[PDB]
Design a protein around this ligand. Structure first.
Ligand SMILES: [Cl-]
Length: 162
């Protein structure tokens, strides 16, 4: 298991524009295109991202390229953030992946927001963190996924993704 596989499971793969759990326009492997409710806005962001006139549809390869860019950006985002880097540096590899997953879904800013949990993570207080992390909209809105990530922080293993 690795971050790529992990995330491919949590986000799925879709080759035509679609709406995420928040009703936003996305494609590929959780690649967010726009929060604009406008589908043409979406198609516009898409062609721009791909480098061609897609007409809302992309190939596998294409999606994979997006994904690669997106994991990369998420790591880097993490390392460039003053609240997050330290956390990341204190964790083990599996747990690092868990952190990366959260940033890929909700962004730096959003994860940087979980102050208390970050601290707990930093202290390696796993059960405490798990609980605290569960007290969030994230958990309430996307429970199966959040449960998987949380368990990952809690156990430091991949069992949730079996
Ligand atoms: Cl879910």
């Amino acid at each position: 298991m690795n971050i790529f596989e992990m995330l491919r499971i949590d986000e799925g793969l879709r080759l035509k524009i679609y709406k995420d759990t928040e009703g936003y326009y996305t494609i590929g492997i959780g690649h967010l295109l726009t929060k604009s409710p406008s589908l043409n806005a979406a198609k516009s962001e898409l062609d721009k991202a791909i480098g061609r006139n897609t007409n809302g549809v992309i190939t596998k390869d294409e999606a994979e390229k997006l994904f690669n860019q997106d994991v990369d950006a998420a790591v880097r985002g993490i390392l460039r953030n003053a609240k997050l880097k330290p956390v990341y540096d204190s964790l083990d590899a599996v747990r690092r992946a868990a952190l990366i997953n959260m940033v890929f879904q909700m962004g730096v800013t959003g994860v940087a927001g979980f102050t208390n949990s970050l601290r707990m993570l930093q202290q390696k207080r796993w059960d405490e963190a798990a609980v605290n992390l569960a007290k969030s909209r994230w958990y309430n809105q996307t429970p199966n996924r959040a449960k998987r990530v949380i368990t990952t922080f809690r156990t430091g293993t991949w069992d949730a993704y079996k």
